[PDB]
Ligand binder design. Structure first.
Ligand SMILES: CN(C)c1ncnc2c1ncn2[C@@H]1O[C@H](CO)[C@@H](NC(=O)[C@@H](N)CCC(=O)O)[C@H]1O
Ligand SMILES: CN(C)c1ncnc2c1ncn2[C@@H]1O[C@H](CO)[C@@H](NC(=O)[C@@H](N)CCC(=O)O)[C@H]1O
Lengths: 399, 399
């Protein structure tokens, strides 16, 4: 544990511009860092909301590591560093608490390191456990349940108002960005068709392409309504585009009764007052979506302590993992140190008090190795390494 | 070095009552301290102007050691602790800079420890060097030359005014304490006889006894003067006791001309104005003595840097001494640790792959001992001991 440090700056303590600066431009930054600091390993985790460097073997240069991130970068050591990673992977350090994306981003960080050669066994253990933990926390708790963005909220609302969306048609009117976000969420959920209309046909062709939908004429809005079940209206011009008369006409046009959900994303409003009172029509706003997202976010936050309990349990596990690792690495070294004295010394008894018992010293050597590894175990790691260094320096020279 | 601490309070930072409190009452305090703190050794140096405890092996309990001295006791470690000792023995921490007494007091501290069993090899090395240094500093520099008290100043003045004192007679008139101090210094220097007079005969008998002199009658003052060469006058009553007429009569009485020095210690003055103008008579005061002492003290202070240079040289020497000590103690332990594995393991090869080469392993063991001692050498002492402990724990158990 103690041989790991974490350095970084995040949205928890810095603004969107202090984060940008700190961001590393080069896809190979994790590799450069390893060389420029003689690290055993490193993983670089960077998103719009954090820049964090995990390093193995940094360790008298932790504050320095902090420096090529930012003058207010924090520095975490050992258990705290791993705990922060576990909190990041589990979604606890994200604005959208529990979000799936940050887990994907931790995995990408791990892969980029794997492929650039900046992983060591220790970071493999930590990251592997971090990744499996993020998955478990999201399965065993409710930390990632419930819509916490406008897009996902629109899907919850549509599902509640209309049922299964798979066979529904979405009409998108206008090009406002929040409208594009809502439409993409509906599309990702699964709908049958998307119709796109805009007062400038070319804006429509563009968005339909994005969405995988069909650009339609703005002047045929009545027929569009007649065939649609969810309407996403986000026009830029300040005039309403969905009128009572058009909606009534669209509904009389269709032989089959079914509910229509109209989501008014524009301000001023795209939907004429009174549309909401037409029978089979439901009207909701961008504000209604923000309310849904907020209620769900507030609920996800109440799962944080259950996730934190999972984390402390997992910390104890990885701690023992890392110890077994060091035990394994401690014996192999010591043994190479003691076998080299054994070999050197083997020749010499050969030249005798003249004028295979191979043997006693392979046994005595095994005994010595076990004795020494424990002793280096046995009082710590701040050291362990140098004493492991000392035994090893002394063996090559004095041996 | 690093295994030594010094704790204490001195006149440099505390007043005469903060020192008293801290003082240890029991002649056996140094021994009690050793037990109550599990020390390898300790020397207690205590005088009216300092209470200092030197401890070997205290070392995670240094601040604690500070506590049974005083809440403002300082704590010195390693080199600084030894440097302070060297400064104390050399007279540099004393009000009377360079004074002989503090060196005697350091030696007594060393002897008391020797005799109570609280010395270890390390404190022997340090104290021995401290003692030999105090002697050298006082021989090779002028740090302890020149009178720096009223008593010693009176001897300088008497010697300058009169020459050799060995054949001179001292007359002491009165019992004022500063008069007693002056007389004792003259006596310690070497005079032929001391006459003691007081308006109360019994006060005289008392002081003469102290001084090893003769009590004489106060009313025979003229004859006393006639036979004396130095007069120390320190009467308590406010009347002058040495009068012009008596001095002239005393001088006409004596066949042989020789100078008389009269030291007036009293205030108001014991000596009548005008006595100083009698031919062959010299009169000086307690004030004149303070002037002499001060000039000499100011001169001794200018030798401080030469003494400090001696000290830094000596620190480097003892530092190497203490290192050789630890090397010696480090090999003997390690060897006992490795020979016990050697012995344990020796039996067992005996039981063979059946169904003296004593020998190869005495050689291999010697090799191992040299290798290991260096490694424990090799990265430090904050540790060295525990690693020396670790090797040793691991050997008894795993061996
Ligand atoms: C080209 N570029 C900078 C870019 N391209 C595509 N998507 C991007 C992006 N930057 C950011 N994003 C996305 O926009 C969100 C807000 O900035 C991003 N959010 C995250 O990466 C979160 N997953 C971070 C969580 C954390 O706690 O660190 C992303 O969805
Ligand atoms: C009984 N008793 C307390 C006592 N008896 C005899 N002499 C004593 C004494 N206490 C002190 N002395 C002497 O008086 C001086 C002033 O207090 C003492 N000075 C010292 O011990 C110096 N040598 C200290 C130097 C230092 O730097 O610590 C002593 O001469």
């Amino acid at each position: 544990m103690e041989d790991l440090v974490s350095v970084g700056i995040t949205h928890k303590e810095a603004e969107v511009e202090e984060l940008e600066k700190a961001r590393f431009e080069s896809d190979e930054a994790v590799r450069d860092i390893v060389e420029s600091f003689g690290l055993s390993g490193s993983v670089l985790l960077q998103t719009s909301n954090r820049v964090e460097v995990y390093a193995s073997g940094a360790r008298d240069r932790a504050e320095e590591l902090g420096d090529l991130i930012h003058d207010d970068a924090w520095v975490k050591r050992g258990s705290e560093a791993v705990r922060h990673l576990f909190r990041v992977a589990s979604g606890l350090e994200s604005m959208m608490v529990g979000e799936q994306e940050i887990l994907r981003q931790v995995k990408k960080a791990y892969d980029r390191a794997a492929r650039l050669g900046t992983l060591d066994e220790a970071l493999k253990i930590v990251f592997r456990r971090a990744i499996n933990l993020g998955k478990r926390a999201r399965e065993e708790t409710r930390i990632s349940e419930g819509a916490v963005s406008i897009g996902s909220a629109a899907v919850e609302l549509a599902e509640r108002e209309l049922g299964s969306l798979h066979d529904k048609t979405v009409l998108v009117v206008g090009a406002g960005e929040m409208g594009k976000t809502v439409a993409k969420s509906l599309v990702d959920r699964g709908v049958r068709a998307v119709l796109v209309a805009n007062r400038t046909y070319e804006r429509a062709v563009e968005l339909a392409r994005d969405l995988g939908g069909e650009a339609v004429r703005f002047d045929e809005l009545v027929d569009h309504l007649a065939r649609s079940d969810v309407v996403v209206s986000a026009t830029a011009a300040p005039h309403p585009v969905i009128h009572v008369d058009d909606v009534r006409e669209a509904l009389r046009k269709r032989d089959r009764r079914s509910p229509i959900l109209i989501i008014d994303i524009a301000n001023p409003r795209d939907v004429e007052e009174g549309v909401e009172n037409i029978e089979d029509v439901e009207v909701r706003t961008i504000d209604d979506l923000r309310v849904i997202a907020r209620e769900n976010l507030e609920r996800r936050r109440k799962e944080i302590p259950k996730v934190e309990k999972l984390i402390e349990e997992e910390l104890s596990t990885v701690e023992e993992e890392l110890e077994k690792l060091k035990e394994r690495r401690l014996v192999a070294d010591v043994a190479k140190s003691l076998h080299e004295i054994k070999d050197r010394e083997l020749e010499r008894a050969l030249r005798r008090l003249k004028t295979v018992l191979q043997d006693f010293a392979e046994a005595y050597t095994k005994r010595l190795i076990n004795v020494l590894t424990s002793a280096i175990m046995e009082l710590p790691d701040e050291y362990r390494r140098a004493a492991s260094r000392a035994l090893r320096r002394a063996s090559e020279l004095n041996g």
